[PDB]
Design a protein around this motif. Sequence first.
Motif, PDB file in Angstrom:
ATOM      1  N   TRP A 176       0.868  -1.163   0.000  1.00 58.14           N
ATOM      2  CA  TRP A 176       0.000   0.000   0.000  1.00 58.14           C
ATOM      3  C   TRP A 176       0.911   1.221   0.000  1.00 58.14           C
ATOM      4  N   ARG A 210     -10.012   7.034  -3.893  1.00 60.71           N
ATOM      5  CA  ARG A 210      -8.609   6.687  -4.154  1.00 60.71           C
ATOM      6  C   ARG A 210      -7.983   7.793  -5.004  1.00 60.71           C
ATOM      7  N   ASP A 227      -4.738  -1.427  -7.292  1.00 62.86           N
ATOM      8  CA  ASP A 227      -4.609  -2.759  -6.703  1.00 62.86           C
ATOM      9  C   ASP A 227      -3.857  -2.663  -5.380  1.00 62.86           C
ATOM     10  N   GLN A 230      -6.054  -1.729  -2.361  1.00 63.66           N
ATOM     11  CA  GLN A 230      -7.259  -2.490  -2.050  1.00 63.66           C
ATOM     12  C   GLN A 230      -7.463  -2.579  -0.549  1.00 63.66           C
ATOM     13  N   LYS A 231      -8.708  -2.395  -0.130  1.00 63.37           N
ATOM     14  CA  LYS A 231      -9.067  -2.457   1.281  1.00 63.37           C
ATOM     15  C   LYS A 231      -8.531  -3.728   1.947  1.00 63.37           C
ATOM     16  N   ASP A 235      -5.977  -9.060  -0.894  1.00 60.23           N
ATOM     17  CA  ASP A 235      -6.270  -8.887  -2.324  1.00 60.23           C
ATOM     18  C   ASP A 235      -5.234  -8.045  -3.062  1.00 60.23           C
ATOM     19  N   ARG A 236      -4.379  -7.369  -2.305  1.00 62.63           N
ATOM     20  CA  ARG A 236      -3.336  -6.538  -2.890  1.00 62.63           C
ATOM     21  C   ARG A 236      -2.271  -7.424  -3.508  1.00 62.63           C
TER      22      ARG A 236
END
Length: 256
Positions: A176, A210, A227, A230-231, A235-236
Amino acid sequence: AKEIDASCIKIEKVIGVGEFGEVCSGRLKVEICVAIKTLKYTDKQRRDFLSEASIMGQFDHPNIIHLEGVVTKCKPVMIITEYMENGSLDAFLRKNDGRFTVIQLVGMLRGIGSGMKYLSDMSAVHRDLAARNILVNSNLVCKVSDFGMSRVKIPIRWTAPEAIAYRKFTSASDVWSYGIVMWEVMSYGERPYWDMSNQDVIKAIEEGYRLPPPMDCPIALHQLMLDCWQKERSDRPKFGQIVNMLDKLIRNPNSL
């Protein structure tokens, strides 16, 4: 880390001042150019100042600042690392606004990714990934530095949701961070979320907002940022997938 005899380190110029102390750039003889971080301070700083060198000494990768050694048995206590002509990435981009091609910017991110893929494999988490913590050399090779927060005050707009919410730091939260770094690069060191307050950013991200694609930024790159943001951390994309995707973009310039 390895102790080095102060008679080998020869300071030449003071590039600036850091948190714990001054930061210079001299030479190391046994001759090569190197960086020097002096400390001048209470014990409440030395243990943390040097601990950064200790961790940094466990790494050996082209996209991670090389640690020459340290000087503790003598004053001033200092850390010696590879010299980086262009310095901090963020400041470097702001001084060269719109002066680099998409492929060159992508190459820089590729290297940064490669260094992060190295760290994540070592089961290490930077927890403070940002352009201001990435150095650049005359060859445009960007290397991750500042391992003060690593684990084997952190800016909120660079930190992942879970990391702030329930203090959960992992290679997923660095991804992130990498996402934000990508944004800074393609935007030439632009402040993420601009004038928004830390609280606005937190809420904004929770609402699904975002950061938009920087001007002239390829759609594929921005999506890669989406991507990374992603929360659900699961999933990142993994740093391995990130480095892979960028390579295929570099190998095939037309895809950018």
